[PDB]
Structures are given as structure tokens and as C-alpha cells.
Amino acid sequence: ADTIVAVELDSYPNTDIGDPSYPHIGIDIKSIRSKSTARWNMQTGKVGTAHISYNSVAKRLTAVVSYSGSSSTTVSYDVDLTNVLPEWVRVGLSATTGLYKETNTILSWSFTSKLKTNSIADANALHFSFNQFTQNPKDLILQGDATTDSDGNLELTKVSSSGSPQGSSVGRALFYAPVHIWESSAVVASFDATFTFLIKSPDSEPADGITFFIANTDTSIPSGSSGRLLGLFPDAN
Amino acid sequence: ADTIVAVELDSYPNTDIGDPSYPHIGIDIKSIRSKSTARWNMQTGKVGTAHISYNSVAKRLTAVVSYSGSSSTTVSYDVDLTNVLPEWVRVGLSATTGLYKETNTILSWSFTSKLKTNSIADANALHFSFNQFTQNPKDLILQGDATTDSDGNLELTKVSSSGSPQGSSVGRALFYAPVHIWESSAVVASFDATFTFLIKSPDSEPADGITFFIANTDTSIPSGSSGRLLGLFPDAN
Amino acid sequence: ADTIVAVELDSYPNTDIGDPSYPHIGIDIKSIRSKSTARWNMQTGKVGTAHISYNSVAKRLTAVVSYSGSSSTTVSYDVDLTNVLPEWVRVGLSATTGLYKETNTILSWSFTSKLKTNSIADANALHFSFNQFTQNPKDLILQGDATTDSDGNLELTKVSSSGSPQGSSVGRALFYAPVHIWESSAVVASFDATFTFLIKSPDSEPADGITFFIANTDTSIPSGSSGRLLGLFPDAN
Amino acid sequence: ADTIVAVELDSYPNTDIGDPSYPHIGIDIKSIRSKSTARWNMQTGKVGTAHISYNSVAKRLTAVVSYSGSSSTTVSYDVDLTNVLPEWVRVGLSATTGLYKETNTILSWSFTSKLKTNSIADANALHFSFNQFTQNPKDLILQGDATTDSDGNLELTKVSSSGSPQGSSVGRALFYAPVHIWESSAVVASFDATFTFLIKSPDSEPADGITFFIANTDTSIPSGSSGRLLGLFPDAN
Ligand SMILES: OC[C@H]1O[C@H](Oc2c[nH]c3ccc(Br)c(Cl)c23)[C@@H](O)[C@@H](O)[C@@H]1O
Ligand SMILES: OC[C@H]1O[C@H](Oc2c[nH]c3ccc(Br)c(Cl)c23)[C@@H](O)[C@@H](O)[C@@H]1O
Ligand SMILES: OC[C@H]1O[C@H](Oc2c[nH]c3ccc(Br)c(Cl)c23)[C@@H](O)[C@@H](O)[C@@H]1O
Ligand SMILES: OC[C@H]1O[C@H](Oc2c[nH]c3ccc(Br)c(Cl)c23)[C@@H](O)[C@@H](O)[C@@H]1O
Ligand SMILES: [Ca+2]
Ligand SMILES: [Ca+2]
Ligand SMILES: [Ca+2]
Ligand SMILES: [Ca+2]
Ligand SMILES: [Mn+2]
Ligand SMILES: [Mn+2]
Ligand SMILES: [Mn+2]
Ligand SMILES: [Mn+2]
Ligand code: NA
Ligand code: NA
Ligand code: NA
Ligand code: NA
């Protein structure tokens, strides 16, 4: 199995597998069963922003999800990532729909990782930023249903040519380069990610969610990971 | 009185005013009496590095102080900085000697502050980096005894022309521009600082310490802030 | 007199003092009489963007001014800036109106300066970015008529409470910190600036222009610098 | 054939194929026959630094190669890179030896590419920085003889376990991710690279050189590209 750490924007409460009884954001460490969650007043049809951060000194993975003038939902979790992840990883975005559906539309995404070693200059750095997506994003590994559209958006899950979301979809986008997310001689390892997103749905209870995740480099969509497993895990353990 | 938040590298245990009984690093919020400390195996005559970070989501101010191959001392403290500091601040370095003495030599210093508001692009940013100091550092406000030397170092406290440290010294260096360190509409406010330093001393128990601090914009060295008060506070309350 | 290098967005052709006979962008080195100009299809009432760059190896100061889908005007000039400017400068924006008028509204501004010396890490850096302006921009030196408005814009020249531009106005905004724009031991010195702007006017021939400029640190608006002298020069020599 | 743009640090004058009669730096556009060269006072056994820059407004590709206190060699060339390179590229370092030999040791490498579109925020960015190299650099495509060593250096050409350079060697290292180096709607495209290097040799006339290059994404070492062709070209046309 892969090794996964994620920030989930989970629109659909799957209380049979431990979700709280509301839409929520969560921090996931090697399980769909979040280690920490917060209530999320998700707003269909409005552009949201997520900002995720972590550093190895603080050892606190945090996320905030906002809609302008609209709400600010925050979650954090204390964890030593170096003890969980391999030292080389790929970073990505995932999304699913199930019986119920929603767009999982990414409008922009940025990511920064640093390793520091007793200088004002980083010992290692990686940064990428997209404020739109090309028709042929050569620096993305697209998995499952994920595609880019004529508007420059990344559609993680399937949408029809009219823009309507489809059920039973899974898709992911990984940055092409492996990231050296920790190294045993570094003094500090830190990372930050931001993305903006648009979730539209006609459904009473839109589903299922989208995530930013960090994984082993050769990560692939697990078999059986549609709907409530957000394209990340093979089961609900 | 000024309003001060600091990371102290405190070489001299002043147990009468609450220091632990060893050299230590500490996080100071409006008092010399640190809110959190860690033991510090300080090494005279070796170049050290300090890395300080905070973000408004995590609400955890952290520092790590290292000497290569030598030791890694870390301290953190959970606090909401926006509720403590004014929204405009100056950032700086301070140092003192007292009866006992040490160089408080800064070899490099960098600082980054960001404000983010629902885009992959910062809503506001400030960054500065010095890997050496000019003879006339026009972007620094030098206070007290602080000066730059012919080697490109910032000598926060007095040193003789042979390089020997002097007692009863206080000095500070502030970045010239005010920094907008938080703002009530921002989704996230974050800052990072790094500096490298050299503390030499002939004394059995070198004193007194050096700090990175954040203050009201018009901050000045308090009267009576030499030695154990590290140039930051007018008393030990 | 001050020492000035500027990029001018010159809406009004003052052919008596050497302007071409059209609105134009220009590179100005110690004179209002541009060293290089390009025709500018300026569009009142639309948001424009300017990007300015220079590096000491290439020795080519360049600017591009764009309106989305609208036009792209570019100018460059080969010059060794280190031989013209003092090693410490302030950077700023200036604007004027004269008999004829226009808003000189700045919506965002960023600036980066680097000094490099045989490492992958900069020897010195300064960066600032504003994507809006506070009511009390403590890190700006406002000169003349320049003010910030309730919308978060910087109004370099006077506008009425209805937003109508006024004639015979001059204003400038400088970044608070001096910038070490070159240093004799650096291998490379480089700088980049971006701003976005909005020029509205009811006038047949809107006037007079706005600039990004670099000057001696103590620069002030010259006497007699309204209208065609864009707040930068005391005469048209 | 591949499509190549390079900055060459050419230690060995191959005057039969157009080199000047001295060690030199050069800018290469689709040929080994440099479009522009400068004399280079190369210093065996000393660490050097190269800084390379380009932007689409200025249209001037420049390089400077320095040894501290030692010499500063600069070359530039006016060219519109968007008309030469594909819009997606890989970036890399190459080196060769031939009959005569030298180490082609890279100690650090950084690279930044930006695309800007009428905001203070980049429309697209990629940055990477290595201040040393891992034993298994998962974000590098190593070609030919290139390897990383136990000291954290990248040895582009073969060296023995005692550190002695070998003849008839070719090697390259490419960054794993493709780079979107230009795009037809961008207002500006810019890139910067820095690396530090160490060239040791016992030979009277050390050979052959090392380069930073930009190529089509699927670039490979051409057959017959050892020695004077610096691993980049299949012939001397
Ligand atoms: O998309 C929402 C959910 O739809 C499905 O689960 C169901 C939620 N409501 C239901 C109602 C009926 C039945 Br049948 C099923 Cl499986 C479900 C499953 O696909 C879940 O994995 C998914 O989280
Ligand atoms: O520099 C170390 C310290 O020296 C002084 O306190 C003393 C430490 N040891 C002593 C021994 C004797 C006497 Br007298 C004095 Cl005040 C002290 C004071 O200046 C303190 O503020 C300072 O922390
Ligand atoms: O704002 C545009 C210009 O208005 C003035 O110059 C004039 C341009 N057209 C005119 C027409 C009449 C007279 Br009177 C005057 Cl001074 C001028 C002067 O204020 C110029 O400096 C300025 O460039
Ligand atoms: O490494 C230096 C050079 O060595 C070779 O060319 C020669 C330079 N001096 C010579 C002297 C003798 C002979 Br045989 C040969 Cl091929 C050469 C060839 O391998 C060249 O491609 C290379 O630039
Ligand atoms: Ca769920
Ligand atoms: Ca103390
Ligand atoms: Ca004019
Ligand atoms: Ca050659
Ligand atoms: Mn959940
Ligand atoms: Mn203390
Ligand atoms: Mn003009
Ligand atoms: Mn050559
Ligand atoms: Na878009
Ligand atoms: Na130094
Ligand atoms: Na605005
Ligand atoms: Na090294």
C-alpha cells in the first residue's frame, strides 16, 4: 500500500467510517479516518481557497479553508512528518464523487518545500505555482479521470461538456518531480501549499471531496478508492 | 512601555528573575520571564544558526538553534500573536553584556513576512536578507552600542579593536521599514527569520544573550535594560 | 538636485520638451528627455500592468506595459546603472496632472532587488509586495498629493470624493527602507518591479503620466515639477 | 535532432570548429559554434560561480563566471528565445572530457522560471535549488557518466575513487520536471540559473567544458558528442 498524508475537504458525511455528521475539513495520516477535523460551512458555487502549512520544528500540520467574506474554517494536528513519510515523496491533489456528485474544479495551485542547514540560504528548495492549467500540462501526472479544460481549469473528477458533474469519478494530479520533503541532516524542513477551487452541484448533499496529499513517489489510485475514500486509500481502516 | 515578543538565546542563568539554571533558549511574550524555555548547550567560539517561524493558523511560535554537527536546541510556544502585537511592528536583533561578557556578533540575518487572502499570490509580503553588513547600513536603525565592523559583521554589543568583548553593553539593530505583521482581513499571516551568530568569551560564565524581537514601530532601548534584561524590558516583571 | 532613473508612462505629448507626438512609455536617465521611447496605445478606464527589469550583466533596463487582450508596449535601453545611481537609493512611484488631468490610481505594486556573490544564495535581497494599500501605509513615504483611499488604492494625484481627477496635482510614494541597489564587490545586481494601474479621464487629451523611479535616498518633489515634469525633475534639461 | 540553447564554459580551444584561441565562455543557439564568446581566465582547482539570466522583454541572454577575488568574465547575446525553443523544455547541466581531461564537479545549482500576466503575482513559476546532491537524486535525470559522490557533489564526467578525472567522458543531469519556459499569452517570460563548480586537472591544457542548457523535454546525449561537442550536439555544424 501507499503511504499517505492529506488535507481533506470532505463535503459528504460518511458516519459509518468515522466522519463527523457534517461537511468538514480534516487531517489524514495513513487513514481516511481523520486525526483531526473541523466543521466546514461549504458553499457550492463559490470559489474557495485552502492554505496548508507545516514545519519540522513546530511539528504542526495546519489548514485553513476560506471563502471571501464567507467563512474561515481551520484545523491543525501535531505530528512529526519525518517519522511518517518517506524522505522522497510526490505531492498532489485528489478528488472523488460517488452516488452523489460535485465538480472538483482547481483554478490554481502552488507548493513550496524547503530544507535549511545553518545558513540564511535554503539547503534545498522546490517551488511551483500555477494560476491556470495548460491543455497539455507536461509537469503534471494526471491519474484517473483528471483532465484540464478549455477554460484553463483542472477538473479532477468528470464533468460533461455542459459542465455538469458526474458520479462515480476519481482523479488525481501529481507534480512531476519527486520532492525531498525531509532529510536526516536538515535543521528544518518546511512546506506550504495553496489552491483555489470551485465546487458546484445540483445535489441536496454534494459529494464526495477533494484533497491535497503527500505520498510515496510511485503512488497510484488504489483499487476500490472511489466515493468516500477520496482516491487515497484502499479501505476505511 | 513598548510591546515585545522575542526569541532569546540566553547564555547566563539569572535564576532570581526566573531563568532556568542553565544557558537556554526562550520565547518571551511581554516579559523577560520566558513563557517557554529549552536547555541550550551553547558553544563559545563556534558559529551558530537560529531559525524562527510562526503562522497564524498553527499559532505556534518556534525556534531552533544549531551548531553544525554540534547540537540542535528547539523551543515552541502556542500563542495568537495578533492578540499581542500591534498590526504594524519593527523587527530587530538585541544583545547585552553585564558584569560578565561575550561577543554578540551577527554574521547574517534574513526575515520574511506574508499576509495571504484567497489567492496563490500573497496579499502582502516583506523580505530582507543580509549575508553581510555594510559599513553604513542605511536600512538598519542602530541603537545603543550596535555597530558594523570592518569584516562585515554586525557587533550588537561593544568589542575592542582587538575583538575582545566589553561588559555593561547594550545594542540593537532594527530593520528600517515597519512591517505589517498581521491585518484583520488576512486569512493567514506568517513570518520566518534566520540569523547566524558568533559568541566568543574569555569568561567562565559568558553573558548575557542575544535576541530576535518584534515590537511596536517606535521601540527604543528601555532605561535600565542592560545585562539580564537583554535590551528589551525596563524591569523583570 | 536629485539623481533620477525612471520608467515613464507618459500620456501627454509635450513636444516642446522632446516627447514624441503620441502617448508613449519611456526610459529616463537624469532627464525628462527620455533616452528611449515607444508608442503607447493607452486605454482610459481599463486596468493596465507594467513590468520593469534590469540586471547588471545584461545592462539593459526594460519595461512592458499591457492591457489584457488590449496591447503590449515595450521599451528598453542599454545602460550601466551602477555608473549613474548612488549605491543606496529609494524606489517609488510618481504622477502628475497639469492643465489636463487623469487618475493615477495604483492598485498593486511589487519590487525585488538582489545582490549575488558566488553562491546560489543572494548576498543581499529586498522584496516588497502590496496587493492593496492600507489607510495608513506605515511603510510608504507619501509625498505631495499622494494618499490612499477607502477602496485600498493608492491615488498618486488628487481625486474628488466622487473619484474625479483634479488638475495641477503632483504626488509620489516611496518605499520606506533605502535599497542597496548596487555594491562594488557584487557579481550581479538585479531588480524587478511590477505595478497595476487605472487611468480614468474625461479629457480629450488626458495628462500627464505616472512613473516608477529610483533616486537618491533623500529624494523630494522638486519645486516646479508639476505637469510635464512628472514630479521628478526641476526643469526640462 | 534535439533543439539546444546553452551557456558553455569551454576550457579547450577547438579552433577547427570555430572556438576562439583561448578558454572562453559562450552562448550557443542550436550550434556548438557559439553566437557570442568572451575570453575566460579559468582557474584550475578554484571554486567558480556562474550566473545566467534572460527575460523576454530585454531579449538578452547573459552569463557571468567568477572566481572570488579572481576574475569576472561576462558574455551576452540578443535573441528571442521563444522563437528558438519549444514552449516546454528540460533544463540541465552537461560536461565532457576528450583526449585531455578535467573534473566537471558541480557543488550547487539553482534555477528559476517565471511566466507573468498583468498581476504582481506570477502566472506560472518553477524554482529549484540544491546546495548539495543526495546519493540518489530522485529529482534528477542522470545521463551518461554523471553520478553523485560521497561528498554531495555532482560529478558530471568520470572521476576515479582517488578523485582523478578521466578522458573520453560525457555526462548530463536534467531536472526531472519539464519547464514551461514560454507561453504565447504571457506578457513576460524570464529565467535565471546559478551554479558553482570545481574544475581540477593535471593536464597542460585541460578539457573539455561544462554547460548549462535548455532543450526539448526528451533530450538525450547525441551519439558522437564527446569531447569538443560538450555532450550537446551530434556534429559541429
Ligand atoms: O457520493 C456519496 C456516497 O455515495 C455512496 O454511498 C451512499 C450515500 N448515500 C447512499 C444512499 C444509497 C446508497 Br444505495 C449508497 Cl451506496 C449510498 C458511496 O459511493 C460512498 O462511497 C459515497 O461517499
Ligand atoms: O552579566 C551577567 C550578569 O552580571 C550581573 O549580575 C551578576 C552576576 N554575577 C554577579 C556577581 C557579582 C555581582 Br556584584 C553582580 Cl550584579 C552579579 C548583572 O549585570 C546582570 O544583569 C547580568 O545578567
Ligand atoms: O496637463 C498637460 C499639460 O498642461 C499644460 O500645458 C498645456 C497643454 N495644453 C495647453 C493649452 C493651453 C495652455 Br495655457 C497650457 Cl500651459 C497648456 C502644462 O501644465 C504642462 O506641463 C502639462 O504637460
Ligand atoms: O579533450 C580535448 C580534445 O581532445 C581531442 O582532440 C585533440 C586535441 N589534441 C589532440 C592531439 C592529438 C589528437 Br590524436 C587528438 Cl583527436 C587531439 C578530441 O577528443 C576533441 O574532441 C577534444 O576537444
Ligand atoms: Ca466523507
Ligand atoms: Ca539570563
Ligand atoms: Ca509628457
Ligand atoms: Ca572547445
Ligand atoms: Mn472525512
Ligand atoms: Mn532567560
Ligand atoms: Mn515623455
Ligand atoms: Mn567553445
Ligand atoms: Na482560471
Ligand atoms: Na561575513
Ligand atoms: Na484593490
Ligand atoms: Na558541498
CSV table of C-alpha atoms and ligand atoms in Angstrom, one decimal, chain D residues 8 10-14 17 19 24 208 228 230, ligand 8:
chain,number,residue,atom,x,y,z
D,8,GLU,CA,29.3,26.9,-22.3
D,10,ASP,CA,34.7,25.9,-22.7
D,11,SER,CA,38.1,25.2,-21.3
D,12,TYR,CA,39.7,23.8,-24.5
D,13,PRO,CA,40.1,25.9,-27.7
D,14,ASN,CA,39.0,23.8,-30.7
D,17,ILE,CA,35.3,24.1,-35.2
D,19,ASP,CA,36.4,28.3,-31.0
D,24,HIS,CA,36.2,31.1,-23.2
D,208,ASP,CA,36.7,20.0,-22.4
D,228,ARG,CA,34.6,19.2,-28.1
D,230,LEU,CA,30.2,19.1,-24.9
E,8,CA,CA,36.2,23.7,-27.0
